[PDB]
Design a protein around this ligand. Sequence first.
Ligand SMILES: *[C@@H]1O[C@H](CO)[C@@H](O[C@@H]2O[C@H](CO)[C@@H](O)[C@H](O)[C@H]2NC(C)=O)[C@H](O)[C@H]1NC(C)=O
Ligand SMILES: *[C@@H]1O[C@H](CO)[C@@H](O[C@@H]2O[C@H](CO)[C@@H](O)[C@H](O)[C@H]2NC(C)=O)[C@H](O)[C@H]1NC(C)=O
Ligand SMILES: O=c1ccn([C@@H]2O[C@H](COP(=O)(O)OP(=O)(O)O)[C@@H](O)[C@H]2O)c(=O)[nH]1
Ligand SMILES: O=c1ccn([C@@H]2O[C@H](COP(=O)(O)OP(=O)(O)O)[C@@H](O)[C@H]2O)c(=O)[nH]1
Ligand SMILES: *[C@@H]1O[C@H](CO)[C@@H](O)[C@H](O)[C@H]1NC(C)=O
Ligand SMILES: *[C@@H]1O[C@H](CO)[C@@H](O)[C@H](O)[C@H]1NC(C)=O
Ligand SMILES: O=C(O)CCC(=O)C(=O)O
Ligand SMILES: O=C(O)CCC(=O)C(=O)O
Ligand SMILES: [Fe+2]
Ligand SMILES: [Fe+2]
Ligand SMILES: [Fe+2]
Ligand SMILES: [Fe+2]
Ligand SMILES: [Mn+2]
Ligand SMILES: [Mn+2]
Lengths: 700, 700
Amino acid sequence: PVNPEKLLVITVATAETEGYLRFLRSAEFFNYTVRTLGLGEEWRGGDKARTVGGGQKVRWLKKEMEKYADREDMIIMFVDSYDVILAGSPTELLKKFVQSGSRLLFSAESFCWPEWGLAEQYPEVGTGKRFLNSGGFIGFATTIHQIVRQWKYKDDDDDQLFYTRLYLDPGLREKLSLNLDHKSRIFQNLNGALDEVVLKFDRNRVRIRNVAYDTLPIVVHGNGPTKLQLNYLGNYVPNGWTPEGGCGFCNQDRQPPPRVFLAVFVEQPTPFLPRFLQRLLLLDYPPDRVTLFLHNNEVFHEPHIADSWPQLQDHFSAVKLVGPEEALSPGEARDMAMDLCRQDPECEFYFSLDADAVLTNLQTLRILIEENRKVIAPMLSRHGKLWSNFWGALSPDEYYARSEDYVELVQRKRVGVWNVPYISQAYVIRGDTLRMELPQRDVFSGSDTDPDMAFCKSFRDKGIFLHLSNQHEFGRLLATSRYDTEHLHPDLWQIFDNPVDWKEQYIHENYSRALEGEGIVEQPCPDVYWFPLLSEQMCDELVAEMEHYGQWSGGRHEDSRLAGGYENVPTVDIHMKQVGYEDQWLQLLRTYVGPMTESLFPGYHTKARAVMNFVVRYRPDEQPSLRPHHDSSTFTLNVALNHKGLDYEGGGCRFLRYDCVISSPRKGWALLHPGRLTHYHEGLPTTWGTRYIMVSFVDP
Amino acid sequence: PVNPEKLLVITVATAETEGYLRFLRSAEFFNYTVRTLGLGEEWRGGDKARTVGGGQKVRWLKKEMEKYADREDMIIMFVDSYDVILAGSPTELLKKFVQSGSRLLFSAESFCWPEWGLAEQYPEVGTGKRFLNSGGFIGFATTIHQIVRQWKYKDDDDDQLFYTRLYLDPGLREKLSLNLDHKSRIFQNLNGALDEVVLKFDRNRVRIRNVAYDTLPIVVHGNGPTKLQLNYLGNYVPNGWTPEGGCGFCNQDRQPPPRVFLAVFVEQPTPFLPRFLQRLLLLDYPPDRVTLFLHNNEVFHEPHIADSWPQLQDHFSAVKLVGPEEALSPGEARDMAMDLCRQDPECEFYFSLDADAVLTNLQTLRILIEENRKVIAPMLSRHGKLWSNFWGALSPDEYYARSEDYVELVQRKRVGVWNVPYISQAYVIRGDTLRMELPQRDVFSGSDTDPDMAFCKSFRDKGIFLHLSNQHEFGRLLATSRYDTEHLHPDLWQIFDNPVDWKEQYIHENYSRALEGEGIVEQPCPDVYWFPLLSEQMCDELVAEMEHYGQWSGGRHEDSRLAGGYENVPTVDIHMKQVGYEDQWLQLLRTYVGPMTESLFPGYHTKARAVMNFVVRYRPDEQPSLRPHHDSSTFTLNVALNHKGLDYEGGGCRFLRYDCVISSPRKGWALLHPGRLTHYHEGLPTTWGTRYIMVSFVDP
Ligand SMILES: *[C@@H]1O[C@H](CO)[C@@H](O[C@@H]2O[C@H](CO)[C@@H](O)[C@H](O)[C@H]2NC(C)=O)[C@H](O)[C@H]1NC(C)=O
Ligand SMILES: *[C@@H]1O[C@H](CO)[C@@H](O[C@@H]2O[C@H](CO)[C@@H](O)[C@H](O)[C@H]2NC(C)=O)[C@H](O)[C@H]1NC(C)=O
Ligand SMILES: O=c1ccn([C@@H]2O[C@H](COP(=O)(O)OP(=O)(O)O)[C@@H](O)[C@H]2O)c(=O)[nH]1
Ligand SMILES: O=c1ccn([C@@H]2O[C@H](COP(=O)(O)OP(=O)(O)O)[C@@H](O)[C@H]2O)c(=O)[nH]1
Ligand SMILES: *[C@@H]1O[C@H](CO)[C@@H](O)[C@H](O)[C@H]1NC(C)=O
Ligand SMILES: *[C@@H]1O[C@H](CO)[C@@H](O)[C@H](O)[C@H]1NC(C)=O
Ligand SMILES: O=C(O)CCC(=O)C(=O)O
Ligand SMILES: O=C(O)CCC(=O)C(=O)O
Ligand SMILES: [Fe+2]
Ligand SMILES: [Fe+2]
Ligand SMILES: [Fe+2]
Ligand SMILES: [Fe+2]
Ligand SMILES: [Mn+2]
Ligand SMILES: [Mn+2]
């Protein structure tokens, strides 16, 4: 039973990169003893991601092994550190080594790298990996010393060719009892084996299983082009995220805060921008510590920015606008904003936020800064859909791909802080990282590749992790896909594409409370109910849209009213059809009036059909009143669109059979009365100003 | 200026017939002096209506004239009396005689009667009547004496041939200055001149005008076959009926009363007979003075008569039934009933009343008896139509014809007591007239002619007037034309043909009062109105008709109710369509429910459309309740058809949104509530007995 106190892990690492630190945490979880060679030095092993190299690893190890040249009592395992995580204990590792009968076991690989023509020389293996991989091997210290002694080559020569050449010596391979871990009992190299590796869960720990060989490896090596697959596994293995404990490295549970450069990007016509700009004033972070940069690409949004700009300038420490007349492409804009932060040593954190990100959590900035990562994004999704501001995986093209755990994360079945290949629309970046690790200006620009992808790739190429937190509800993403800008108030037409935001801007703030009892709804006259439905902004924009159409009814015009004997009872009005708002208004009816009606009239059901939908204008100079009549409806909805007193005098609705009068309508509130038989009614004369109302004859 | 004290009217009359008395009244109106020859004697002048005759007139006149043979100071006018009325004064008559230059003026006639071959011998006249008529002549007494002296012939020879022969003597005609009144200045004979005579009205007097000659005759002679035309004129001329005075011989203003034989005739299936038989008990005339005879030709009416017969037998002095098993034809039945009166000297008046006569005036018998005529009928019309129980005129066929004043009489623009050619369905006849003047048994029978016509003709042939009074509202005539007897209660289906009577039997007696305010209508729940609509008899017959169909609803049956989510809400019921009563029930709705609805819901109009009309049966053993639902109607009508307590326990209607319960329905009363949106409602469980209701979903 070999003693774990005699096992030493040796690894190489010239800097404490996020991968190195991920490795160490996995080593410390199992209580391994880790010696790290090279930590302050310059890497001379060549660009291992483009070419061969790594001989410097062998030189440093050879020098370290001279201490242990005679230590037959010591087992040593050498592993890479930037792309390796440990998944099993020293005890299990040692038992498995001993079972191999080997004196120095190398990991095995599907590819014969870097000289593919050496494959013939290798021994035959039935089903396991055939070839040697230098990223991981374990053996007696005396045997390892005898191998690494023979290093006498350049720092930029290939370490794995060196070991392969020695392994392919039949006399040497037998003298020293050298072996390869063909069936991945100990070492799992991913390159060429992705289809064989799955996560194996436990209550408080995760590891990996090779389903081809039915093994539980100890060492997971994301060798070659599998770093992102290793990134994926390292979110779980060994104690990343677990069924019972959750995430293991996040906070879980949440005097001057760091100065922040906040950069906002308006790169396409985007709905509800006035609302977004107003949210900036509400972000819970001291505004004297925030510098605002706003890039607007859209002349459509210039009035919006202008209205908001005085309040922003008074709010934040400093503000800078870059408008459309500057002709910047989105890539150049984002380079410029990031570089303003990079070049200012007082910029401790850089926070990029696009205009289609709705931050519902006003503490997002604090939360992300406290997470203490180089780069981190809050998870934002489109309402009720899977689409989000991150990708879990990449295609070989390096385009979008759905990771095996994407849906669980978007649905927040698994919450934590995830290492992912792509983030967008909102993220926070350390100022130090921009200065020390990505000093180039051309981060988003440079190739014909999309800027958002180029940015992520820029960070991946430096080995910087991209973190994504779904630990909290942070907000959502607006649909901007087909946003029709040819209206006086385009956001009035957003009831389909952005219904959550549409409701919050146009439905009365006390509507939902009214629909749940609470004694808001009123019944001023028998079977006439009165409730808040439309927000003041909705009334104002709707009136303005009607006046902008300008073509009100006149003589010869006919409505669906019933008075006396086949009389015609018209109003000066505009029907929703004429302005192109029928479909939107029916959606309102379906969603907000239908349910209100069934609640106030128990027993009644409706799908809210209405062929007659129109806005009425009363004035002393044209048609000031509406004579007694019935409506061609099962029930009628009558919504006040302006203020009695401020905008008009007189007016109001009278119900003759009940000698009951609605003398003082409320802007945004609706009347709901039966349309036939019982509620013969009259619109009293408007005596001054202009009185606007919205009328729907539903279920005719 | 000849003195009217020297003018004597001589006429012949063997009896004081109604025509003679009509003549005398017209003579007394103008203050003529009338000598009447022959009053107690036997007429030997032959049948003047079949043949020639009348010589007896000349014999009596010749004897009377011997007194005046030398009285050159006297003017004498001889006229017939049974078919003559005077229309002008003695003064006007005398002036006109004098203007003629004649010493003995005869009336003229279009026909050369009785020897047509004497026409050549007459003098030529341009346009006036050419030939002599003996019914009227005026002249100096000495001249008349010289003419009548020459009478030496049989009582049955023709008087007019005698005068013609003397007139056609050229020497005589010139010696005595004999003349004919060619242009009807004085005498108007109607035969051959009907087209020339019209009535000329004045405030308090009527006369006739000859429009061919533009004259105003003094003497109107209905000679030959024009007696009925004279009958017509004599209703006005000279003071019969006048614009300002009205009728001149009627009462205008209305201790043992005469014994009466009342005879009732049921000669065809007739509607509402139970009601008619019940009316007999209400006739305002002492029942101990009335003998009832009832002839029923219809087995359909045997149960009706049987139900009523105990009350009739207890009511009247004596009663006799003659049923269908006696095989009597209507003619034999009416002969038999009239002859029972004829042969009983205690039968002072005979009153014949058919079963389709509705006497609304319970004093009809008194009124007609007080009118003191031989034969008189009260005017009865079919509701809102011109058809009545009399004819004003006869065709040459002696069939129906419309008199020039028929419509004015039916519409009661002219009221009085009229001499008319035909009466039917109700009339009163003096017992004496039957004994003394129509002793034959075969009054209605004898020829293949209709009995009703034969009866009138029988009386006309004896010169008996047929009187018709429209001086009062007496009643109406039922339509019996197409009476469908193939029902359990045929009168339920009479809403079209006899709507006045249908209303009085089936509509609630307090319906009309309720429709005119008076605080009968109730509103037991908000916008649920409650009013009396159906009579108890209507409910009882309607239920019984449904149970007699017997085929009530069951499983798989679907109604037009709306509950929850596309649930099916059935009732065990029968729809009006199935029993063949839809059209009738819609008529009820149109006529009685429509107007009630518009009165209780001011502003609403309806033509009372209803596709769903049905009777519901609730029982503990089948379907006792009706779960909460809405109706496919603008408003719903809900009529109770039996008695809570007597016939069922439990039941009632509940309106959930109003926490209001109709716990105690009223048989025959209707509920009226809106059908949609507001009045979600439930039929409570019937716990004992059977609860029937009538339901209509109107305006769906
Ligand atoms: C929604 O409901 C709230 C609470 O019922 C309303 O609040 C009040 O507003 C009045 C006048 O604006 C104030 O005098 C009260 O002090 C407020 N009460 C509270 C608890 O805030 C609010 O006005 C309603 N909103 C709308 C648009 O009608
Ligand atoms: C129609 O209305 C009359 C009067 O309102 C009702 O008459 C009364 O009936 C009750 C019970 O039958 C008696 O106690 C009263 O004395 C009656 N009053 C009078 C003035 O007659 C009559 O019942 C109503 N008819 C129906 C069928 O409901
Ligand atoms: O600048 C560098 C590059 C690499 N390494 C170490 O050398 C190993 C070899 O690099 P890599 O794992 O990327 O090569 P591959 O396994 O993909 O062939 C890394 O894991 C680190 O342990 C290092 O210390 N500094
Ligand atoms: O039974 C009779 C029939 C006739 N007359 C008288 O004789 C007249 C002649 O009869 P009528 O007028 O019917 O004959 P016509 O004028 O039609 O030829 C009558 O008007 C009566 O004045 C009479 O007294 N008794
Ligand atoms: C690691 O060592 C500590 C004692 O030094 C011990 O308490 C802990 O449980 C060990 N953990 C594992 C996973 O072996
Ligand atoms: C008839 O005579 C009386 C007097 O005897 C007279 O009062 C009356 O007015 C006269 N009527 C007519 C119509 O001549
Ligand atoms: O002006 C009002 O409030 C009543 C008008 C009405 O109900 C209608 O549009 O038909
Ligand atoms: O039984 C009742 O009174 C209620 C039933 C009803 O209204 C219906 O027939 O639809
Ligand atoms: Fe309109
Ligand atoms: Fe209306
Ligand atoms: Fe039914
Ligand atoms: Fe119902
Ligand atoms: Mn590696
Ligand atoms: Mn005559």
